[PDB]
Amino acid sequence: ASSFEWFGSNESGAEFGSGNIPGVEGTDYTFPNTTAIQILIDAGMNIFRVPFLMERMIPTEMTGSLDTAYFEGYSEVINYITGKGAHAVVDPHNFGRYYGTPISSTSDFQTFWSTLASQFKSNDLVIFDTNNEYHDMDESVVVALNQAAIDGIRDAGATTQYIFVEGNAYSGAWTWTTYNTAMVNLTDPSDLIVYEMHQYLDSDGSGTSDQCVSSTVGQERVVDATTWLQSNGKLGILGEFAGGANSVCEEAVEGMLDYLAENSDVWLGASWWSAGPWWQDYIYSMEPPNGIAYESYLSILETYF
Numbered sequence: 552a553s554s555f556e557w558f559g560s561n562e563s564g565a566e567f568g569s570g571n572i573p574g575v576e577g578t579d580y581t582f583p584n585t586t587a588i589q590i591l592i593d594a595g596m597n598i599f600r601v602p603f604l605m606e607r608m609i610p611t612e613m614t615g616s617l618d619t620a621y622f623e624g625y626s627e628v629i630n631y632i633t634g635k636g637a638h639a640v641v642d643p644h645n646f647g648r649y650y651g652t653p654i655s656s657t658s659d660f661q662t663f664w665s666t667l668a669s670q671f672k673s674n675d676l677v678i679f680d681t682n683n684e685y686h687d688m689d690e691s692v693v694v695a696l697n698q699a700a701i702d703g704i705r706d707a708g709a710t711t712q713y714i715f716v717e718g719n720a721y722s723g724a725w726t727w728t729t730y731n732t733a734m735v736n737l738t739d740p741s742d743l744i745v746y747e748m749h750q751y752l753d754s755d756g757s758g759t760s761d762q763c764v765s766s767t768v769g770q771e772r773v774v775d776a777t778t779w780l781q782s783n784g785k786l787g788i789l790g791e792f793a794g795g796a797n798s799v800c801e802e803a804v805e806g807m808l809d810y811l812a813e814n815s816d817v818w819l820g821a822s823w824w825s826a827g828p829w830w831q832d833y834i835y836s837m838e839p840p841n842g843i844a845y846e847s848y849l850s851i852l853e854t855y856f
């Protein structure tokens with residue numbers, strides 16, 4: 552049946568227009584469309600990562616209360632996903648920063664995470680994602696923020712959910728051993744840590760180009776991260792990946808997913824970047840019915856569902 556435990560998609564919109572905080576719904580940001588989500592569920596996708604902004608969720612100070620409108624619109628999406636039996640990944644899409652400044656106190660972060668997790672604590676299908684793509688920060692501080700997220704989450708009473716932790720250097724697979732070897736030390740009472748890495752297939756590994764450097768680069772860029780997972784006895788999920796709608800990229804995505812599936816003892820699954828209702832013309836749009844990656848990649852991806 553399934554090549555992995557999890558295969559699915561990011562659902563973007565709540566994190567758009569981050570230059571506008573709080574911003575206005577329908578103008579600067581939107582929430583994902585549950586009808587399109589249901590289309591992806593019917594196709595067989597069982598995990599959806601949902602980005603949002605920390606500043607819109609808990610304004611002013613991350614130790615404060617939740618914004619009612621933003622939490623309501625967001626958790627409507629989360630509860631739609633889990634109500635259908637799929638996993639919903641709660642993604643603070645904040646790059647380790649809060650109002651632009653790198654986060655530097657584990658207490659405020661932990662209190663943020665208690666406040667947020669308390670709202671989902673009895674939902675076994677929610678997955679908490681500590682922060683999207685830490686980058687250009689002190690590695691020991693990145694580790695400490697992942698640990699503070701774990702601590703705040705479990706202390707909120709949310710002990711049955713998986714926790715996706717993310718590394719420095721944009722949590723890239725192809726650079727994991729270069730930058731995030733120190734991520735081993737993370738501890739969870741529930742023992743439900745999964746190392747979420749991201750991988751794109753263009754020259755700089757950012758994905759801003761819809762060109763892939765070769766038809767085998769996807770496979771090459773995940774070998775070291777795989778052996779790192781095995782050697783240290785860790786689990787991982789490729790929480791973001793994508794490729795341009797051309798043959799070389801399609802073959803690279805195929806080979807990378809074949810390799811990861813061969814090592815499904817440590818690789819728990821994958822999610823495409825990205826779906827959602829405001830991607831019209833995006834090079835990687837998984838949004839049905841007419842997204843480019845939905846038209847060109849769905850038939851490839853559904854092999855692994």
Ligand SMILES: *[C@@H]1O[C@H](CO)[C@@H](O[C@@H]2O[C@H](CO)[C@@H](O[C@@H]3O[C@H](CO)[C@@H](O)[C@H](O)[C@@H]3O)[C@H](O)[C@H]2NC(C)=O)[C@H](O)[C@H]1NC(C)=O
Binds near residue numbers: 587
């Ligand atoms: C949320 O997602 C739903 C489901 O995709 C959106 O509804 C759909 O909107 C599209 C575009 O307006 C409709 O597309 C058309 O379909 C017919 C063929 O059936 C085709 O002749 C046209 O060329 C075009 O492809 C689609 O039928 C429609 N589906 C349903 C069930 O209404 C909806 O607009 C989205 N709402 C948002 C973004 O908030």
